Amino acid sequence: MGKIVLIVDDATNGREAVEKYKELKPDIVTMDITMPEMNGIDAIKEIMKIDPNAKIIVCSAMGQQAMVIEAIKAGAKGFIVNTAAVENPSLITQLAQTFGSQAVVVAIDAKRVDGEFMVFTYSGKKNTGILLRDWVVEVEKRGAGEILLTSIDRDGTKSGYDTEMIRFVRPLTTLPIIASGGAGKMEHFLEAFLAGADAAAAASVFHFREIDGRELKEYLKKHGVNLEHHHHHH
């Protein structure tokens, strides 16, 4: 509702992402480290210095346990899994028990196929056959901290978030839902929140100067949408 999430993939330099955090100033930042060449953990240190109270999330490659450890040392609070967690749900349960359920994020890239919601793995390239309904229920029971609802059909459209998928997922989970895909203008953000999303992620709209970060924050304020906190300005 009132949280902004920035997505920095391996294709963007860590220095660039840090500069964006200064101007935009989001609440949550997701950075990819599966390609060490980009100095992912180095950027994580930069985010902490600018705002040590930020929620940093790190995406690790399947099988890099020590990589997850380093990301935590950098000040990360949460870490993400996708195809690995789906193939072996036991990993999600173990991760919650060890570092706290709130630190494990289960990401699901989904599409509408055969008249039912179906999960896709491998960056949404290949269908698994697992139903979106059944997977979401399992993720909650496993102790997943949060769930990332990604719409592959809407990704890159920039014509509004997949409000259909958002509403459909909401009744099956009591976790925070991070909606990703379709974000092109301020109107799309407001729609996604009404659909029951807890936070909205956007990367393209910022890098290409499509939406103004500061004006976006003002928009949410005007509608009376904010988290339970105390405001003090002079």
Q: Is 9 annotated as a binding residue?
A: yes
Say what the alpha-carbon torsion angle 49, 54, 55, 58 is, to the nearest 10 degrees: -30
Active site residue 155: no
> What whole-number distance in Å separates Cα of residue 152 and Cα of residue 175?
21
Q: Is 10 annotated as a binding residue?
A: yes
Apex 182 CA angle, 62 and 24, nearest 5: 80
> What whole-number distance in Å separates Cα of residue 25 and Cα of residue 53?
12
Q: Helix, strand or coil for residue 108?
A: strand
Nearest alpha-carbon partner for 71 in 96, 34, 100: 34
Annotated active-site residue in 27, 51, 109, 162: 109
Q: Is 134 annotated as a binding residue?
A: no
Residue carrying the six token digits 């950027």: 43
Residues belonging to the binding site are: 9-10, 32, 34
Active site residues: 109
Residues belonging to the binding site for Mg(2+) are: 9-10, 32, 34
